[PDB]
Amino acid sequence: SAQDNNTRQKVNEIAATARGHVGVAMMSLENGDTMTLNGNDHFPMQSVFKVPLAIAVLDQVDKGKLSLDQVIHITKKELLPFTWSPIREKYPEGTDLKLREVLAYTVSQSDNNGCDILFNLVGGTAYVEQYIHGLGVDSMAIKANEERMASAWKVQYTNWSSPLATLQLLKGIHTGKYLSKASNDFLLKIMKETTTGPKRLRGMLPADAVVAHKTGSSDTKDGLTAATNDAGIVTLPDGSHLAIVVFVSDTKVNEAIREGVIARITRLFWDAAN
């Protein structure tokens, strides 16, 4: 269709403004049509990987190994300094938090210490990786927690995904494929109750649009930003849903240009829905 040719051409033009490695995957969830750009290429996930982490944790809740109300005793030693951590900022001497609260801090606020606490609770990155692969999500790797990612610039590239692999997870979240209704509802709740990335998926969508998403961001080193990502499920006015993954990687352009790629592509798909 000329409608989809125009959409595809505009995705390419928007992506080109990042002058980098751009991956896009979208699906109209109820109908099943998809569009991709570099959909099988590999991209650093950064904090997008807190989504597969959360699925692995909630799977253990469903299986009876964990409980959302179980108390996590967080010591000062587990709260690494320097790293982004609303938990540490509020509880610099440690605290007790319910598992549901650690999950909310990790997914909704991207807490790096919450992330590493959750990885440790489920058996580490190796456990989460094999669990995700067991779901049939092959084109993803989870090798490093946040502490290890901070140790050297290159480590983030070992936690990679293709746009389609992240799309797979979004489709599975949308349909409740991996999690009980209660655990899946909770995951969607915490993915919706975030204020991160207002200029990404949300940048040019109506402010009251419902968007369940997770951002990922690297620092900028030698002018290169490894990752500027957003992935989520958008509810359209007609009640149907779009799954949208945009990874902007390995570019020297500034933050406004990088985030604008995500925002403009997302609004393009919103406007292209009928």
Residues lying near Cl ion in the complex (CB under 5 A): 124-125, 138-139, 152-154, 165, 254
C-alpha distances in Å from residue 58, one per residue of 100, 118, 172, 182, 261: 10, 11, 13, 10, 32
Nearer to Cl ion, 155 or 210 (CB): 155
Please tell me which residue in 47, 85, 110, 218 is annotated as part of the active site: 47
Active-site annotation holds for 146: yes
Give the residue closest to Cl ion by C-beta. 124
Task: Tell me the Ramachandran region of residue 32: left when phi exceeds 0, alpha when psi lies from -120 to 50, beta otherwise.
Answer: left
Residue 158 makes CB contacts below 8 A (sequence gap 6+) with: 141, 143, 144
Please tell me which residue in 108, 146, 161, 218 is annotated as part of the active site: 146
Residue 143 makes CB contacts below 8 A (sequence gap 6+) with: 125, 129, 155, 158, 159
Nearer to Cl ion, 127 or 180 (CB): 127
Least Cβ distance, residue 151 to Cl ion (angstroms): 9
Q: Coil, strand or helix: which one is 142?
A: coil
Least Cβ distance, residue 224 to Cl ion (angstroms): 12
Q: Coil, strand or helix: which one is 218?
A: coil
Least Cβ distance, residue 142 to Cl ion (angstroms): 9
Nearer to Cl ion, 211 or 246 (CB): 246
- φ/ψ (deg, to 5) at 95: -170, 175
Residues 198, 92: Cα–Cα separation, whole Å: 28
Nearer to Cl ion, 72 or 205 (CB): 72
Least Cβ distance, residue 175 to Cl ion (angstroms): 16
Active-site annotation holds for 180: no
Q: Which residues are catalytic?
A: 47, 146
